[PDB]
Amino acid sequence: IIPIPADSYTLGFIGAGKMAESIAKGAVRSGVLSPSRIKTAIHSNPARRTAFESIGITVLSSNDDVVRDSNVVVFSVKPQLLKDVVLKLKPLLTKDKLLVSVAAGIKMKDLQEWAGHERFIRVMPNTAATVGEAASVMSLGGAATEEDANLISQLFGSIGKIWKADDKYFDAITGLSGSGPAYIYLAIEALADGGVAAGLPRDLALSLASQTVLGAASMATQSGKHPGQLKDDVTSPGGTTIAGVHELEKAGFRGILMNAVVAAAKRSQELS
């Protein structure tokens, strides 16, 4: 358990997919890494090779070589393939290398058991990694150090925001930040459909809907205020906003969103 060199470490991705590509691009963009400090290896699809090579990243010929050449190893394969991937690599997974999993639904207890050591960090990012606005949460294995956590905080900070939490919260996280973007995609479409129903052109309705949601969320993220207070700030007496708000409350809007999170969290738990 030697500290990973914060400014010069090399990063390897096992599973050269979309999430790996997003993280790589983000980290290159933010200057946290350069392409020469990133490695991956393809599986069956040769189009993935091109994706990485075109951003300056070297694609090695096996998972084993990626691990050998890396200080930090990110496992970014589909969850149901992760166990075998880790077991095959296990002789190379020495405690001087920080391991990271972004696999949905795979618990730290299992990660540590497969790898045979506890210098492991789990991250649950979300789809908005692609635009640098992921909501990510990390949980630390028994031997991950504070400096390991800072390294991962800086890396994932390059594709959005990143918070820390106990591993036991990750089913609920999955139902909220993991699954939530679909709730808001529905909301955006519905708001646009509402605009069109009220007489607006469809291109404008959609443009407004998307930017309205973006603006409101940016207020919530930057203002330091409770969402109730933000709502209070915009509801003028007897005005349009409160008329719309009343329709939401008549229908139990808040309880519907709560239901969705809860159902999604419960599903996460059922899928293990």
Q: Which of residues 199-238 bind Cl ion (CB under 5 A)?
A: 236
Report what 152 binds from a copy of itself, Cl ion, ligand NAP, none; CB cut-off 5-8 Å by kind: none
Residue type, 44: S
Residue 113: CB partners within 8 Å, gap ≥ 6? none
Q: Which does 112 bind (CB under 5 to 8 A by kind): a copy of itself, Cl ion, ligand NAP, none?
A: none
Stretch of 126-134, 148-156, 212-220, 256-264 lying at the interface with ligand NAP (CB under 6 A): 126-134
The answer to whether 79 contacts ligand NAP (rule: CB under 6 A) is yes
Task: Please identify, using beta-carbon distances, which residue of 150 and 240 lies nearer to Cl ion.
Answer: 240
Which residue, 12 or 195, is less far from a copy of itself as judged by CB? 195
**Does 16 contact ligand NAP by CB under 6 A?**
yes
CB of 60 to a copy of itself, least distance (A): 29
- The span of 38-46, 107-115, 162-170, 254-262 binding ligand NAP (CB under 6 A) equals 38-46
155-194 CB burial, b ≥16 within 10 A, e <16:
bbbbbbbbeeeebeebbbbbbbbbbbeeeeeeebeebbee
Restricting to residues 177-216, name those near ligand NAP by CB under 6 A.
178
Taking the least distance from each CB to a copy of itself, the nearer of 145 and 207 is 207
Annotated binding-site residues for NAD(+) read 18-19, 43-45, 63, 77-78, 104
> Which 73-112 positions form the footprint of Cl ion (CB under 5 A)?
none
Summarize as ranges the residues that interact with ligand NAP (CB under 6 A): 14-20, 43-45, 48, 63, 76-79, 81, 85, 102-104, 125-127, 129, 178
